[PDB]
């Protein structure tokens, strides 16, 4: 993929319960896979900020629950590294649901986003509230 412009330390795993930062009716999301990643023997597939991940809805509305939808990691708790050497970390680990053409499933996204996710998934950025 296109460079992030920052070094991440993968703060999530497969089976990790993260938040759904949108209005889709999805509250809690559970990571299943990390698009394009191939691991090694005996390693939980790690996910980081700005990764298109395959997800399943844990908590939410009856019509949205039990669905296997794709999403992008918007926020994470583990510090990421900006070029100027500064580290950045968020309050929680969150993601927004996305479609085939990488457009957000909702309209309004909750909480702050990172400026690195903007370059890659711009259709999510031109729908973002706050950008840090």
């Amino acid at each position: 993929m296109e460079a992030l412009g920052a070094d991440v330390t993968q703060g999530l795993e497969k089976g990790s319960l993260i938040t759904c930062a949108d209005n889709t009716g999805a509250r809690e999301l559970k990571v299943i896979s990390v698009h394009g990643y191939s691991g090694t023997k005996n390693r939980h597939p790690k996910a980081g900020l700005g990764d298109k991940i395959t997800v399943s809805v844990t908590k939410g509305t009856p019509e949205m629950r039990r669905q296997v939808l794709e999403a992008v990691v918007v926020r994470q708790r583990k510090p990421i590294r900006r070029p100027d050497g500064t580290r950045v970390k968020f309050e929680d680990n969150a993601a927004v649901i996305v479609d085939e053409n990488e457009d957000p499933r909702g309209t309004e996204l909750k909480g702050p986003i990172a400026r690195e996710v903007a370059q890659r998934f711009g259709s999510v950025a031109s729908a973002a509230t706050m950008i840090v």
Binding site: G5, T40, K41, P83, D84, G85
Partner: protein, 337 residues
Amino acid sequence: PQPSRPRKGSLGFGPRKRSTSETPRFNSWPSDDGQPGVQGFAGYKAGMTHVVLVNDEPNSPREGMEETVPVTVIETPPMRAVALRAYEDTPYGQRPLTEVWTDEFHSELDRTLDVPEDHDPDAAEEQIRDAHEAGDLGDLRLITHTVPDAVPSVPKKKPDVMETRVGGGSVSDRLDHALDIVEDGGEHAMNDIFRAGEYADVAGVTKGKGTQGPVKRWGVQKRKGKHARQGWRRRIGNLGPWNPSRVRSTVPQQGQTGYHQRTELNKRLIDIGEGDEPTVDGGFVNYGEVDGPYTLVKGSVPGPDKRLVRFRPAVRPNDQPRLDPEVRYVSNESNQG
């Protein structure tokens, strides 16, 4: 069906034993391009600090922006090229012929060497020119040496001597270039061979870690789960199968870790300067105050603070030279925080 996995540790840096010379010994030297000169310098490691730069790469979208880059501070005081050596092309490889020595030596060079009192440079030089005329002269290298007494933070005064190749021009014009440095006193700084912004190769003997186990040494798995409580924690599954009824040298075992010679490739020189610009507040940890000739090497460098490191123009570079970077800020903050 037993999932695949690459073997633990590399099998190229073998055998993992203690090094013979703490002083790195190169086995490969650069190709001959233009101007005749020495193919390498050497210094003593000092410590680390970060430096802010301006992105020199025209392929990067960050071209022009401030970027923080880590830098290894290495003091590089002027060396003395005390001699010149020649190799004859024998069917057994490249065997040495003769050496051309000086007159003016260093007051404390007799701490390692048996300093010559009566030498004949003239007729030895004649033998090299007759071997050149014959067409059997190989590569010409200079016996270089360091001045540890120039570094106040290093307790060693006993000079580290090492051989360094000269190349670039025709075999005739480089033999003469070498002889010219020698007749003066052999004084040469880093400015003579290296320009800032260039990619060099730092060779050094690593930090001494003593005898360490398989997990640390070859990065093998610690015993997992239930298998960790039965009395086996950091010991491997087995030494091999039934047949071959012998333990292979490829199986991760215990032994000596560290004090191995490594040749760390493509190291960018960020700045070559003199004075107290890279020094730290409170001095460098387990080293001391840097004031004088130095080099700023990007990233890390093999060996501990006080050990001798060696430089060479990159034998295998990937990126095109981006000379003299705009070094905006160099940190001075204490490494005791």
